[model samples]
Target: SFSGYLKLTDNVYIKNADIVEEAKKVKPTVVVNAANVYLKHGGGVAGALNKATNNAMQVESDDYIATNGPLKVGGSCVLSGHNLAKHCLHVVGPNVNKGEDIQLLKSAYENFNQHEVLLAPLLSAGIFGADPIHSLRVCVDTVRTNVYLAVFDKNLYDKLVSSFL
Candidate 1:
């Protein structure tokens, strides 16, 4: 609805509703996402610095006022970033558990390999004070290899992948 892009196809179906009350009527099956989960702030180096000092970062606060003039800050919750790709879609999904994350990662990677996606921003959980490290450890201990994880830090990212390899 936001964008007026459409394709002329016979099998196309469109539906609309009040998001707050309707989207959850019928449970969703596979939700594709392109935003970080499990962190109040997205945990970029800049975001990390901001949260540490109780201030906004270079791209998310007053400090970024005139920095990237043409940049646009957009996303759900508290995630904000310049959508620099040719086409970008930020899909938000519920962070259930490590098993769900593994499924999401697998599907996301498959879509990317097929040119259906350019980016798939992901993380473990975003519930206020939940530790992403614990989340990653759960995935590593339970799931098999090939389930790519973009957790709270590079260490967990590598560690999870290594466990699978």
Candidate 2:
């Protein structure tokens, strides 16, 4: 169930909807991977985008992040073509169970600015383990470009709506 839109800026907006559908409509120039340090395209939004792109996302990520080993928090990799968007920007959000470093989270979103439309998720709210609503706030506050954050969790979506209101 789609809730609605919460405008963060004239350009940036948060919406509760299927990310894949929303992303298709926007045809974003870049899609954030919400990836782990290892860059493994396993589950969550990262997995969805990887499948949607037929593993091209992981292939690109491998070439970029694999050799360097796991990307540290705020570290990112940029990939192009054979994917949902023109580019895939993989950012390593902090593993919240280990405790989040707020500064690193801020840097994650700030890393990409040249992009117009971006399909992003609540960083670390999934497997990385963080409060979804809190993570959403960080995303909305930090991102500068027009970003559509996919909120699939109904409870998480509700909380976001109320928090914004």
Candidate 3:
């Protein structure tokens, strides 16, 4: 389902819809894959994207991690060779119940600031197990490019809609 979009800036916006469906519609220049530090591309957003790109993203991510090192909990690594988007940003968000994931997520967006259109889920909310509202707030504050929050949850969508209204 596609909901309305709230444009925060000329380039940045938040949208309510199914993440995978929204990704297909937007065909964003960059796809921010909130993944583990190991870049294994297991479940959640990472898994979907891995399947979408026919494992190219996983291969590149593994190569990057192998050459450079595992991306820290606040850091990110940009990868190419994926068919979905021009580039993919692998961000390692915290999985533990600590409150520091917010700052770490902030750092992820800060690390990759260049893109015309970027698609992101509710960072740290799904498998990462963070509060949706809190994560959305941090995302709204940290995003610096043309961004779309591909929201799926009805509660999250309603909350975002209410905030604008």
Best by TM-score: 2
Q: State which candidate, 2 or 3, has the greater lDDT.
A: 2
Per-residue lDDT of 83-151 in model 2, one digit per residue for the tens? 467777887888777686755777777765657667777777777787776776676677777776777
For each candidate in turn, give its C-alpha RMSD to the true structure in angstroms. 16.2, 3.1, 3.1
Candidate 3 Cα deviation (angstroms), residue 100 = 6.3
Task: List the candidate 1 regions with Cα displacement exceeding 4 Å.
Answer: 1-83, 97-115, 123-152
TM-score of each: 0.29, 0.83, 0.82
How far in Å is the alpha carbon of 32 misplaced in model 2?
1.1
The lDDT of each candidate is 0.30, 0.73, 0.72
**Candidate numbers sorted by TM-score from highest down:** 2, 3, 1
Question: lDDT of candidate 1?
Answer: 0.30
Give candidate 1's TM-score.
0.29
Estimate, for each residue in 1-165, the C-alpha lDDT of model 3 and write its tens digit: 224677755645677676566666656667788777889998888888888888888888888778988878877777872666667777777774544545676776665566655777767878777777777667667776667777767787777657642
Query: What's the residue-level lDDT of 148 in candidate 1?
Result: 26
